[PDB]
Amino acid sequence: SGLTPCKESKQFAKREKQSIKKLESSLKIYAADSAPALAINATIEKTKRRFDNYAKQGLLCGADGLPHLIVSGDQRHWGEFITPGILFLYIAGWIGWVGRSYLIAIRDEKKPTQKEIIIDVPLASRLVFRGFSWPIAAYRELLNGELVAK
Amino acid sequence: RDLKTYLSVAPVASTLWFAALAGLLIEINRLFPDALTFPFF
Amino acid sequence: KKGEWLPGLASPGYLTGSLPGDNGFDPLGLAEDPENLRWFVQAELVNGRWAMLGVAGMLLPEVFTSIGIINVPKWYDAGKEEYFASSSTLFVIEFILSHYVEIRRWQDIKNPGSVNQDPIFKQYSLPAGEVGYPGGIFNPLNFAPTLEAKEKEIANGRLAMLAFLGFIIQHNVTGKGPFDNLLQHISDPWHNTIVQTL
Amino acid sequence: VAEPDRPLWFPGSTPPPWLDGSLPGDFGFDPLGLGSDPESLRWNVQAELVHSRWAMLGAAGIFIPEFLTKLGILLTPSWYTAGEQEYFTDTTTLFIVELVFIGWAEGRRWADILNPGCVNTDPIFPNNKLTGTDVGYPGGLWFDPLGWGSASPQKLKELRTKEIKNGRLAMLAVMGAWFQHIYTGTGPIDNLFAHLADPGHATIFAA
Numbered sequence: 313s314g315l316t317p318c319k320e321s322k323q324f325a326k327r328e329k330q331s332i333k334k335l336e337s338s339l340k341i342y343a344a345d346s347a348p349a350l351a352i353n354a355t356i357e358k359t360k361r362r363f364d365n366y367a368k369q370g371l372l373c374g375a376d377g378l379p380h381l382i383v384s385g386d387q388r389h390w391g392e393f394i395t396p397g398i399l400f401l402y403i404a405g406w407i408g409w410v411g412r413s414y415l416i417a418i419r420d421e422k423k424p425t426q427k428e429i430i431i432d433v434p435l436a437s438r439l440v441f442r443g444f445s446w447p448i449a450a451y452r453e454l455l456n457g458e459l460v461a462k
Numbered sequence: 463r464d465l466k467t468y469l470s471v472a473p474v475a476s477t478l479w480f481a482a483l484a485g486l487l488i489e490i491n492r493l494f495p496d497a498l499t500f501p502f503f
Numbered sequence: 504k505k506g507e508w509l510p511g512l513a514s515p516g517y518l519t520g521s522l523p524g525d526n527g528f529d530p531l532g533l534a535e536d537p538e539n540l541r542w543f544v545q546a547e548l549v550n551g552r553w554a555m556l557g558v559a560g561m562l563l564p565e566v567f568t569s570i571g572i573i574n575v576p577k578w579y580d581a582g583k584e585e586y587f588a589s590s591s592t593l594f595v596i597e598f599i600l601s602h603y604v605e606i607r608r609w610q611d612i613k614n615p616g617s618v619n620q621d622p623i624f625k626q627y628s629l630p631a632g633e634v635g636y637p638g639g640i641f642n643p644l645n646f647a648p649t650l651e652a653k654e655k656e657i658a659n660g661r662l663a664m665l666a667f668l669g670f671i672i673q674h675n676v677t678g679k680g681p682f683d684n685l686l687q688h689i690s691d692p693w694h695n696t697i698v699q700t701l
Numbered sequence: 702v703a704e705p706d707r708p709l710w711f712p713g714s715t716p717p718p719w720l721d722g723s724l725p726g727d728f729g730f731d732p733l734g735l736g737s738d739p740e741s742l743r744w745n746v747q748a749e750l751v752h753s754r755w756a757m758l759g760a761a762g763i764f765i766p767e768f769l770t771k772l773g774i775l776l777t778p779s780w781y782t783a784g785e786q787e788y789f790t791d792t793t794t795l796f797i798v799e800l801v802f803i804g805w806a807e808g809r810r811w812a813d814i815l816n817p818g819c820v821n822t823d824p825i826f827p828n829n830k831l832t833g834t835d836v837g838y839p840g841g842l843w844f845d846p847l848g849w850g851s852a853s854p855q856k857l858k859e860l861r862t863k864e865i866k867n868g869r870l871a872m873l874a875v876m877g878a879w880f881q882h883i884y885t886g887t888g889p890i891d892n893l894f895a896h897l898a899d900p901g902h903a904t905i906f907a908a
């Protein structure tokens with residue numbers, strides 16, 4: 313954390329300033345009441361909103377003038393890494409768990425490959441929401457998690 | 463036609479799936495752009 | 504006949520209906536395995552029981568405070584200051600005791616034979632036979648623990664948890680109290696709803 | 702109860718085999734073979750019935766501009782633009798309320814489609830019951846007080862056919878009104894009058 317918060321970084325302010333002037337420059341050729349003008353003014357308003365949020369959410373900045381992320385585990389920045397991540401692992405786990413629920417449903421059947429190239433959508437729709445409680449995979453792990461043959 | 467349903471759910475199932483995903487992702491961004499962090503906690 | 508959480512649908516097979524509060528409700532097949540089912544039954548009990556007191560503990564004082572019979576802070580506020588002993592001391596204490604009494608029912612769950620050793624001297628014991636339904640001193644009044652009677656406990660617990668879920672979520676966004684939230688809704692329901700708040 | 706010498710949408714043609722003629726309103730019309738398979742068909746029949754019933758209620762929507770145009774009334778607001786109004790409590794709230802009741806209504810009909818029973822009960826009073834056999838004809842006092850619903854085939858068929866035919870007509874109607882407004886930016890009835898005044902030059906082309 314050898315950095316300075318973005319709220320109080322001159323370089324971070326110079327970037328917002330320089331960016332807006334560039335978009336405003338383009339604003340000149342199109343005159344006022346105009347489609348491009350409204351499009352550029354919308355980018356400018358989207359630009360201000362962006363920088364505003366970064367400062368607002370206490371993100372440090374580097375001498376470069378750009379925010380940098382802390383992933384150490386520090387509590388002030390869970391938003392930077394840890395919070396989104398857990399969110400990921402939830403979804404990743406969801407997808408994988410549902411995907412594995414399908415293969416087991418498919419495995420003891422006729423031609424199993426037939427449903428791997430042509431999806432059983434009724435079956436899939438039945439199993440998709442099981443991923444919602446996928447971290448109760450843990451309780452499968454206490455018993456039938458993985459194969460004993462290997 | 464059973465069969466038409468059958469053409470579907472092939473790798474057209476992938477594109478219908480990813481097109482839906484792309485749409486959802488795009489709208490989220492349109493709604494919440496330039497997000498570098500999760501700020502709700 | 505059993506109760507159907509969903510009329511048209513059929514109940515799953517592992518749900519015999521020999522269980523209190525069984526309405527064939529396992530759409531995600533969490534209880535397909537029987538062991539999981541036992542564990543979950545026990546879990547539902549306790550999650551349901553704590554919620555009962557909690558909802559009650561949380562709600563009633565708020566109501567009484569408004570009546571003016573007594574003055575206490577709102578549940579989401581009991582935490583800051585004002586107690587003999589710090590917050591830390593209570594915790595460690597809460598922990599030591601909760602740790603003992605549970606690391607305690609757990610034994611009865613794995614193998615149902617942990618009723619003796621009461622107190623340290625062995626004179627007193629618990630006589631009975633259902634997990635998560637201990638007897639003895641636990642039931643001073645000896646109300647028949649009739650099946651169906653158990654049905655009522657579960658329903659309340661299930662209800663309590665929706666309430667608890669409601670209180671907490673309601674707290675955010677609202678920034679007020681459940682009873683307060685209720686008054687706002689009661690004063691003018693069509694203008695006070697999740698719609699006006701969010 | 703199939704009739705093969707029934708009139709057809711296409712007099713010369715041959716109808717598909719699945720379109721038996723047993724069903725009400727069957728003119729042997731499925732060029733795309735959408736009703737090609739029995740399972741799909743049952744579903745389609747129910748869907749058409751609902752669309753037809755809903756469309757008919759919608760037709761009333763056509764009805765109001767009539768009185769407002771001449772009789773008057775508080776129904777003067779055009780159906781178009783009707784939604785964005787301030788009455789009562791805000792629309793969004795209304796919609797949410799609507800979603801719950803109607804949901805229960807189908808999370809309701811749906812069970813019936815999938816099964817044969819559930820009519821069998823009024824959950825609160827398990828005795829009110831009510832029964833009508835057949836699919837999208839629940840029957841009972843709530844839906845069939847007069848009881849003209851229960852009857853005999855031939856009669857039921859005739860009556861039922863009437864239900865569907867009006868519905869199909871109603872469906873085109875509603876769609877026609879929606880398009881009519883956009884292409885004309887006016888009232889449908891005005892469109893109606895305008896047409897009569899100058900059917901010769903008053904058409905889609907006029908604009």
Ligand SMILES: CC1=C[C@H](O)CC(C)(C)C1/C=C/C(C)=C/C=C/C(C)=C/C=C/C=C(C)/C=C/C=C(C)/C=C/C1=C(C)C[C@H](O)CC1(C)C
Nearest residue numbers: 529530531532550553554557560561578579581664667668
């Ligand atoms: C079943 C199933 C299966 C299928 O298959 C699938 C699905 C559907 C997924 C599912 C699910 C379900 C569910 C949802 C469940 C939930 C539950 C809950 C919510 C609970 C709570 C629960 C809750 C709870 C316990 C709570 C409790 C609480 C408490 C005590 C409290 C206390 C307190 C008080 C007094 C006062 C202060 O101031 C605060 C406090 C301290 C805090």
Ligand SMILES: CC1=C[C@H](O)CC(C)(C)C1/C=C/C(C)=C/C=C/C(C)=C/C=C/C=C(C)/C=C/C=C(C)/C=C/C1=C(C)C[C@H](O)CC1(C)C
Nearest residue numbers: 731732733734735752755756758759762780783872875876
């Ligand atoms: C695919 C195919 C294939 C095969 O094989 C052959 C064939 C048969 C040819 C085909 C086709 C067919 C068709 C064409 C269909 C169509 C339909 C329709 C159009 C419907 C509508 C339908 C329609 C509908 C429902 C509608 C409804 C409506 C409504 C309710 C309304 C309501 C309302 C009103 C009143 C008034 C107010 O102010 C507003 C509102 C609220 C809005």
